[PDB]
Design a protein around this ligand. Structure first.
Ligand SMILES: [Mg+2]
Ligand code: NA
Length: 354
């Protein structure tokens, strides 16, 4: 049988000359077998969910720090780096941000002067959320996802910005405010990232590229691009990945791979294998070949890449299962990592440890 993750060489040790090796976690993953894998393999962590806006400030002025603090304390106790995910997102964000002083959605307002009053209110709220959160964690966090998923996959406006509530209310100003406020409160040395998925594919890659150039020219503080890397076995290509990271490096921006998982399924993900034991070993081999090429590329790009984080630990816990179930009538199992649901290594582990 394949040995347990804690019986093989550490990924963080393998890649110590190149970049951090990170995992997304929940508080319950900090102990038991998950915690043993974590301590063995990784030198960086990020909160899967506990640091999202709604997790930290679910009502106006009501902050809930318990889960986030557990993860911070774990990083401190275990000498791990710590990514903060995330100051600004259009998902997992409480609806109170976006209500006017009468308690109605700001997006519905048709009086332009009132829209401008709303924009200032929302930006002030965003400043207060960032200040409060940053002041708590500024000595612990080594990379901030200041904004998440602000760029569109299409082109609904000239700049290719996602038309979330943030954009409808503030245009791009929420993005500027977010970075400026993060810098102000976190300090001159804090590393500030814009994070997104599909950063390897156009038009998105280029909308992102233009946005970071625009903000940089305007003096907005941005240090790096977070590439979520929710990828497949055959897509995106190695060269697409390389080009994107080189493009951002050419601007003087750092790159981090922030939410890496290698799905077994394209889009749409059906038919999915219904259970883990139904997945044929050949699929794990195809995955291992992918992982091999990926990590060769990341090593090749290591002058321009400071951290590689997987969006989870082992195959027993991944949002990809939710995605699989969503497209296959409630049944389906994905397997995106190099450790199996029992914490045993997979073929992919051996192909990235060598
Ligand atoms: Mg290899
Ligand atoms: Na590096």
């Amino acid at each position: 049988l394949q040995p347990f993750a804690w019986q093989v060489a550490s990924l963080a040790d393998r890649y110590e000359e190149s970049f951090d090796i990170g995992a997304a976690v929940e508080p319950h993953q900090l102990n038991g077998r998950q915690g043993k894998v974590l301590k063995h393999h990784y030198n960086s962590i990020v909160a899967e969910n506990a640091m999202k806006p709604i997790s930290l400030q679910p009502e106006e002025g009501v902050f809930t720090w318990d889960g986030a603090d557990a993860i911070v304390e774990f990083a401190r106790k275990n000498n791990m780096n710590l990514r903060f995910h995330t100051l600004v997102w259009h998902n997992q964000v409480p609806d109170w941000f976006f209500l006017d002083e009468e308690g109605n959605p700001m997006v519905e307002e048709t009086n332009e002067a009132k829209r401008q009053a709303n924009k200032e209110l929302l930006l002030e709220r965003l400043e207060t959320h960032i200040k409060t959160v940053v002041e708590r964690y500024k000595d612990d966090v080594t990379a901030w996802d200041v904004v998440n998923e602000v760029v569109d996959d299409g082109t609904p406006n000239e700049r290719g910005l996602r038309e979330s509530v943030w954009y409808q209310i503030t245009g791009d100003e929420y993005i500027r405010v977010a970075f400026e406020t993060a810098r102000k409160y976190a300090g001159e040395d804090a590393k500030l990232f814009i994070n997104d998925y599909n950063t390897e594919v156009t038009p998105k890659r280029d909308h992102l590229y233009n946005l970071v150039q625009d903000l940089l020219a305007d003096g907005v503080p941005i240090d790096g691009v977070g590439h979520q890397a929710h990828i497949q076995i055959d897509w995106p290509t190695i060269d697409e990945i390389r080009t994107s990271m080189e493009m951002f490096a050419g601007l003087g921006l750092d790159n981090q791979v922030t939410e890496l998982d290698v799905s077994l399924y394209g889009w749409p993900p059906r038919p999915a294998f219904p259970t883990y034991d139904a997945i044929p070993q050949e699929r794990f081999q195809a995955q291992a070949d992918r992982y091999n090429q990926l990590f060769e590329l990341y090593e090749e790009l290591d002058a321009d890449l400071s951290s590689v984080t997987f969006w989870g630990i082992a195959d027993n816990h991944t949002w990809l299962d939710d995605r699989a179930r969503e497209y296959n009538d409630g049944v389906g199992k994905d397997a995106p990592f190099v450790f199996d649901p029992n914490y045993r290594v997979k073929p992919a582990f051996w192909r990235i440890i060598d």
